[PDB]
Structures are given as structure tokens and as C-alpha cells.
Design a protein around this ligand. Sequence first.
Ligand SMILES: CSc1nc(-c2ccc(C)cc2C)c2c(C#N)c[nH]c2n1
Length: 208
Amino acid sequence: EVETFAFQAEIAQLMSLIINTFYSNKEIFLRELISNSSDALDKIRYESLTDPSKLDSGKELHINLIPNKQDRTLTIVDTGIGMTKADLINNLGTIAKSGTKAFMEALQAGADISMIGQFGVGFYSAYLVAEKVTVITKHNDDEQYAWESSAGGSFTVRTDTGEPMGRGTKVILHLKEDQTEYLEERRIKEIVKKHSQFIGYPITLFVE
Ligand SMILES: CSc1nc(-c2ccc(C)cc2C)c2c(C#N)c[nH]c2n1
């Protein structure tokens, strides 16, 4: 069943900072998560220009936004390259130790939280609006895994059973009680239009 890991001290810190720092422009979380999905989809793309059997786990390269009012969740699904178990543990494939260093320094020197994606740690912006984040992932080589964290210094990794996905990553944001605006069609559309309107892959906003 479930393995528990300690975040590296630098990530544990960034996350406390993201969670605790007063910052009203929370919406940038969606641009950062769509920008990582797009990066993951560029990667599966690049790979398949030399090995087309890579697209056998699925040819459609896209991004879905799925809000669920009853579960209070907003899910970003992509059919990107996915992460193997080691990717997920090595904090979701990021240089997060060195990025938090560069980021926390960039903040000292006049940056604001909205620039987080320049240091390749934009994922953690999910903790502006979510109390809990589950990342379900499937890379061609490996199993389907679930990663989960409610911050506080640890995360879990397990094998995910059932809901097979073929290839990619889902980020499920369990929203905080007072960030439910991010479940509204109108607000999601406004934010994609403000910050993500020239992404290179179709983004579909699901209706409830
Ligand atoms: C390289 S495969 C991959 N990785 C990520 C991702 C990247 C970095 C981090 C810290 C976390 C995730 C889930 C996403 C992601 C996010 N966030 C959305 N799709 C993704 N696909």
C-alpha cells in the first residue's frame, strides 16, 4: 500500500511560504499547472517524432479542466509524458531544491509569488487554493501511481488501481473552503483567457 516521504527542507519551506504568505492574486495557480501540462505534452510529442510507438498509449494531445462542485475539486488532466515512480518522488520531475533557492532569493530581491514558474517550481502554486493535491500519473514504462500531499512536510506515493488512464498526469486540487470560485465556468474561462490563451494544445473546460 502507502509510502510516506519527507519533503526536502527547501520545498517544505517554499510550501509553508506559499501557504502562509498573504497574496490575493491566487489565480496564477491555473496558468502554472496548464504550463506544466503543456511542457509534459511537448515532451511526449518530441519523443514520438523519433519513436511513434510512444503514442500507442494515446495519440490525442490535450488538456482537460474538470470542476466538480460536489467533491469541491478542480482537476487538470493532460495526456503528456507522465512520470514514473522515481520522477514523482524526485519531486514531480522538478529541480525543486535549486529552484526554491533561486525563487526565495528572487523574492528577497523584489519578485512576487506570480513569477514562481520562472524557477521551475510553479506546481507548488497549487497550494494557493488547494488544501490537498493528488497527482495521478502514468508514463509508458511504468505503473499508474498516485502522489498526495496536504503539505505539512510529507507526501505519499502509492500504486493507483482501477481508473486506468493510458498516459499522462492528472492534478486533483481539493480546494480550500473559500476558494470555490475556481469551480465556476465563468471564472475558469476568464482565467484561461487572461493567462493561457495561446497554449499549443486544445484545452477543454468540462461542464457540470
Ligand atoms: C513531466 S510529466 C508531468 N509533470 C507535471 C508536474 C511537473 C512538476 C511538478 C513539481 C509536478 C507535476 C505534477 C505535470 C503537471 C503539473 N503540475 C501537469 N502535467 C504534468 N506532467
